[PDB]
């Protein structure tokens, strides 16, 4: 039913068009930390805990 | 006589006919006369038989 067919004298019969689309992405930030004291390092039995 | 011909092809192609399936041919001219001595032209008007 939807085939493009011409005739003997054909003009302005079969017009077509085009389309484009877009994609996107984003970035985020992460992080974490820990704390300690001087006594914890100095008086601990295990050196090199750091 | 001035004659202009355009066969079907690229030259016929336009927005009205994007495929160029048509053609044409034409002819034209100019004409005119000047009468200097009208009295030298004679005419007779009659009926004619079957």
From Swiss-Prot, chain A:
It comes from the Viruses. It is found in: Virion. Assembles, to form an icosahedral capsid with a T=9 symmetry, about 60 nm in diameter, and consisting of 535 capsid proteins. This is Major capsid protein. It comes from Enterobacteria phage N4 (Bacteriophage N4). The lineage of its organism: Viruses, Duplodnaviria, Heunggongvirae, Uroviricota, Caudoviricetes. The gene is 56.
